[PDB]
Every structure is written in C-alpha cells, then in structure tokens.
Amino acid sequence: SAPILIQGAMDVEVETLVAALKDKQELTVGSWTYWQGTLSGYPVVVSRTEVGLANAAAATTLAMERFQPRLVINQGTAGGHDPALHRGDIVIGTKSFNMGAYRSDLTPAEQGVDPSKWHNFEVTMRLRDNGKLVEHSSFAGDPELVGRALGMADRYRHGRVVPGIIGTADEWNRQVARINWLHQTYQTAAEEMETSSAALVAEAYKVPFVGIRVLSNTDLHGEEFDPQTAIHCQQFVIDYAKALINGF
Amino acid sequence: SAPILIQGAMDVEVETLVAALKDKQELTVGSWTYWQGTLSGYPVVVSRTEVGLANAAAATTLAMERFQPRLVINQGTAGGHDPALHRGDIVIGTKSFNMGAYRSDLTPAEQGVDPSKWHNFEVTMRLRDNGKLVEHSSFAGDPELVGRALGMADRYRHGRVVPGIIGTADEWNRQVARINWLHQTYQTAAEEMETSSAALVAEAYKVPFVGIRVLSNTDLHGEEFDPQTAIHCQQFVIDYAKALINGF
Ligand SMILES: Nc1ncnc2c1ncn2[C@@H]1O[C@H](CSCC[C@H](N)C(=O)O)[C@@H](O)[C@H]1O
Ligand SMILES: Nc1ncnc2c1ncn2[C@@H]1O[C@H](CSCC[C@H](N)C(=O)O)[C@@H](O)[C@H]1O
Numbered sequence: 001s002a003p004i005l006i007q008g009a010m011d012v013e014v015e016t017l018v019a020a021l022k023d024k025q026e027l028t029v030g031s032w033t034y035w036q037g038t039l040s041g042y043p044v045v046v047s048r049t050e051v052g053l054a055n056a057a058a059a060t061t062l063a064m065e066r067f068q069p070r071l072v073i074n075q076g077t078a079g080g081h082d083p084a085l086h087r088g089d090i091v092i093g094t095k096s097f098n099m100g101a102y103r104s105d106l107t108p109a110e111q112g113v114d115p116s117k118w119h120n121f122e123v124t125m126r127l128r129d130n131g132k133l134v135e136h137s138s139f140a141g142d143p144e145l146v147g148r149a150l151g152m153a154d155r156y157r158h159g160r161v162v163p164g165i166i167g168t169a170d171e172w173n174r175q176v177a178r179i180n181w182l183h184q185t186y187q188t189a190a191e192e193m194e195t196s197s198a199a200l201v202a203e204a205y206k207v208p209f210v211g212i213r214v215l216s217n218t219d220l221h222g223e224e225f226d227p228q229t230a231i232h233c234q235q236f237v238i239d240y241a242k243a244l245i246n247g248f
Numbered sequence: 249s250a251p252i253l254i255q256g257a258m259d260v261e262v263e264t265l266v267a268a269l270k271d272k273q274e275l276t277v278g279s280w281t282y283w284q285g286t287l288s289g290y291p292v293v294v295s296r297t298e299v300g301l302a303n304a305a306a307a308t309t310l311a312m313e314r315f316q317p318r319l320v321i322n323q324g325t326a327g328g329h330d331p332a333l334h335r336g337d338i339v340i341g342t343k344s345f346n347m348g349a350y351r352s353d354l355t356p357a358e359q360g361v362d363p364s365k366w367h368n369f370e371v372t373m374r375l376r377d378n379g380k381l382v383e384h385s386s387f388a389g390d391p392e393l394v395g396r397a398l399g400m401a402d403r404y405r406h407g408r409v410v411p412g413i414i415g416t417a418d419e420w421n422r423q424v425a426r427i428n429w430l431h432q433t434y435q436t437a438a439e440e441m442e443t444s445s446a447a448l449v450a451e452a453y454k455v456p457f458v459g460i461r462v463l464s465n466t467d468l469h470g471e472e473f474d475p476q477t478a479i480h481c482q483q484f485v486i487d488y489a490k491a492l493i494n495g496f
Contacts (some may be wrong), residue, residue, distance in 0.1 A: 052372035
C-alpha cells in the first residue's frame with residue numbers, strides 16, 4: 001500500500017510515466033502536480049517537481065506529507081561531466097551532492113575572482129535527526145536500489161547504464177573548462193538541478209532514494225539536447241518500477 | 249486563527265523568538281522543528297529551517313502543510329553586499345532572488361572559466377499556477393509588509409533599517425571582488441542562503457512573505473561575525489509581529 005514516488009522536473013520528463021499509470025487521480029498543491037495511480041496493480045505517485053533545488057525540495061516534502069511513499073525514484077535528464085559518457089547513457093547515482101554549494105576564503109578586491117579556490121559548502125547538506133545535527137557531504141543512493149538498476153542494464157537499449165556521481169546545482173554549465181574542473185575535482189558523471197535536494201528530503205524522512213539520470217546532452221562531445229532521451233529514461237524507469245513491484 | 253510563521257535557520261537565529269512565545273509545544277518532523285505558541289495572545293509558529301535553499305524550501309513547505317500560516321516572516325543574519333551598509337544594519341527585502349542560479353553560453357576548454365559570463369538562471373524561480381507556467385526573476389516582499397517594517401525603522405535600537413535586495417545562494421562569498429561584482433550586477437544589499445527559497449514556496453502557496461535580515465558580517469568593512477546581531481534582529485521582528493497582531 002505505500003506508493004513508490006517517481007519524480008521528474010519537466011513535462012517531457014513525466015508525461016510517459018503519467019501515461020503508464022492506471023486509474024489516475026490528479027492533485028495540485030501550490031506549484032506542484034501529482035498523479036496518483038497504479039503500475040502492475042501497485043500504487044505509484046508521479047510528481048512533476050519543476051526545476052531546481054528549491055522546487056525539488058518543496059515537491060519532495062509535499063509528497064512525503066501527502067503520500068508517505070515507501071521509496072523515491074528521482075529521474076530525468078542531465079549534462080555529461082565524464083568524457084567517457086555520451087548522450088543517451090544513463091547514470092545510476094551511487095551518490096548525489098550539492099555541487100553548487102560554495103564557500104570561499106577572504107581575498108581583497110585586488111586579487112579578483114577565482115572559482116578554483118571555492119570549497120564545497122557542506123553545511124547545505126547538514127540535517128537534524130531527532131533534533132541532533134547530522135553532517136552529510138553527499139547522499140548515497142540506496143545501494144540495493146542502485147544495484148537493481150545496474151542489474152537491469154541489459155534491458156535499456158539506447159545507451160549504457162553506469163554507476164556514477166550526480167552533481168546537483170542550480171546551474172547549467174556550458175563552459176567546458178568549468179565542466180572539466182568540476183569533473184576533476186568531484187569525480188562527477190553528470191550535472192543536473194534536483195537530485196541531491198530531493199535526496200536531502202528523502203534522508204530527512206528516512207525513505208530509500210535512488211537517482212536515475214539520462215544524459216540528454218554533453219558539451220564534452222558536442223552533443224546537443226535530444227528530448228527523446230527523456231522518454232527513453234522514463235521507459236527504463238517504468239520497467240525498473242515494475243520489477244520492484246513484482247518483488248513486493 | 250491562522251498563525252504568523254517566523255523562520256530562522258540557526259539556533260542563534262530562533263532562540264530569542266522561541267523564548268518570547270507563551271504556551272509552547274515543540275514539533276519535529278523529519279529534519280525540521282517548529283515551536284507553536286502565542287505572541288500577544290495570537291498564534292505564532294517559529295520554524296528552525298536549517299541552512300540553505302533545499303532546507304528552506306522543505307521547512308517552508310512542511311509549515312504550509314501543517315500550519316497553514318496567514319503570512320511568513322523569514323529572518324536571520326546575512327553578509328553585506330552594499331558598501332553603504334554595516335554589521336547591525338537590517339535589510340527589508342523589497343525583493344529576493346536566487347543569486348546562485350547560473351547559466352552560461354558554450355565556451356571551449358581553451359577559454360578557461362569566466363564567472364562574469366554566468367548569468368542568472370531564472371528557470372530556478374519559475375513556478376506553475378493552476379497548471380500554467382509563471383516566470384519569476386525575483387520574489388517581491390509583500391509591499392505592505394515591507395512598508396510596515398520600514399515605517400518601524402526608528403524602533404530598531406541597533407542600526408539602520410533599509411529597503412534592499414536580498415541575494416540568496418548556497419554560498420558564503422568572501423572574495424571581495426566577487427561580492428563587488430554581485431552587488432554591481434544585481435544591486436544586492438546582502439547575501440544569505442534561505443530567503444528566495446522560502447519566498448518561492450510562499451509564492452506557490454500565495455501566502456504574503458517578507459524577508460528581514462540583519463548584517464552579522466561584511467567583508468566590505470572587515471566586520472567579522474557578531475552573534476549579537478541575530479538576537480537584535482529577533483527583537484525587532486518580535487516588535488514587528490506584535491504590531492501586525494495588534495492590527496488583526
Ligand atoms: N546540462 C545540464 N545542466 C544542468 N541541468 C540539466 C542539464 N541537462 C538537463 N538538465 C536538467 O533538465 C532541466 C534543465 S533547466 C530546464 C530548461 C528547459 N528549457 C525548460 O524551460 O523547461 C533541469 O531540471 C535539470 O535538472
Ligand atoms: N555572509 C553570508 N553569506 C551567506 N550566508 C550568510 C552570511 N552571513 C550569514 N549567513 C546566513 O547564516 C547561515 C550561514 S551558514 C551557517 C554557519 C554556521 N557556522 C553553522 O554551522 O550553523 C545561513 O543560514 C545564511 O543564510
């Protein structure tokens with residue numbers, strides 16, 4: 001009875017999921033729409049989160065309060081950070097983190113601006129549990145959920161399914177030198193704008209979480225946005241959810 | 249009666265507020281704690297949001313769902329961006345925005361990294377209203393709430409009270425050239441890590457919102473963190489809330 005929550009930011013990242021639901025009921029609260037239905041006879045809630053960290057955290061929190069899901073799959077599109085990956089490849093998030101969180105040391109105006117000196121600002125991922133502070137430098141994908149997606153790699157026929165680190169920021173980077181620096185510094189597979197924020201809320205509520213992201217683009221190979229990748233990602237995630245459901 | 253919601257991120261930014269409440273009870277869900285009580289006999293909820301955009305959005309959303317407040321005051325400490333301002337001055341947020349949101353045009357690796365080319369990525373503040381996309385390049389503080397705070401300026405005993413733009417980011421900037429660039433580009437009064445995120449959720453729920461921030465520090469004048477500013481801000485906010493309550 002507790003539903004599986006499946007998230008996407010954009011319309012193109014959720015409409016295939018929504019079409020797969022049986023006996024759909026729609027709910028909109030604030031800026032956030034949910035479709036409550038079934039897959040393989042089991043309750044599933046699809047959430048259109050809108051874009052970015054604030055939207056992701058709001059949409060996830062609202063879903064926790066309204067639906068009490070048993071697990072969360074956050075999915076959608078991303079941009080490549082690892083040169084080994086191409087448009088259409090899918091990253092299963094071994095961990096996600098707030099890549100956009102920056103703290104910098106004091107420098108006078110004369111020294112200019114140097115982002116290579118900025119440090120990851122981990123307080124942005126700090127939480128409390130029963131009122132006690134718990135530090136986080138990243139959020140691990142639930143390792144069984146991660147393993148399951150990797151084991152199903154053969155069922156995805158539009159690229160490779162690989163484990164990787166998902167870097168979350170309110171950013172779309174197209175300065176290739178910046179992408180390279182972020183990859184070298186944080187070992188990122190891909191960048192996007194929601195995962196670690198949804199993951200933060202899932203950790204606060206102690207609900208298993210996994211991020212699943214297709215590269216819709218990568219400037220490391222001159223590969224521009226292809227909307228079909230979002231559809232292919234949802235097809236894989238439907239299969240994945242159905243497998244989980246067969247298991248329940 | 250629908251409560252006034254008053255927010256602060258850190259313990260030092262809420263303990264004075266909490267001490268002011270009568271007939272309290274303390275509620276924690278996930279990572280977020282709320283104190284429900286009364287000020288001047290009127291219901292008030294004090295929220296400890298924890299730090300950063302994801303936490304602010306989660307804490308605000310959770311408060312909307314649990315308490316349905318009639319208005320939101322987000323307050324706490326900030327770092328100066330405007331050279332005219334000093335530690336202890338209070339900024340009333342005429343608007344707040346996601347200063348950390350960055351989009352850049354394509355540049356090849358050989359051109360390196362140039363943050364002066366990172367433009368504000370407005371999609372991070374885009375919402376939906378009854379299913380329809382609504383752009384936001386910032387969130388205006390409720391203008392009557394803003395005006396009221398400005399009208400009470402001479403009731404603040406420890407510095408100026410000024411209107412200004414609040415720049416929200418998962419960042420603590422201490423590169424003075426970077427502070428200067430953000431101020432020149434966005435006309436920011438001060439920087440902090442929650443306001444526009446809480447504001448985004450308040451806009452989605454159509455609940456009046458105002459940000460009230462004291463400068464606890466500014467590297468434009470070599471003024472390091474002073475925790476007493478946080479206490480002073482809360483005293484001003486209590487006075488302000490009591491004024492609204494008298495009005496109800
Ligand atoms: N290269 C990239 N960098 C950052 N986010 C990316 C990305 N590629 C895809 N994304 C994801 O896709 C969305 C991009 S922002 C949305 C842009 C789109 N034109 C619109 O108006 O809706 C975000 O949800 C983000 O998580
Ligand atoms: N100069 C500044 N830049 C960004 N945020 C600032 C700031 N000065 C104060 N803040 C605010 O104060 C908090 C700083 S991060 C918290 C740091 C503190 N040492 C701790 O561990 O709890 C954030 O909530 C932020 O909104």
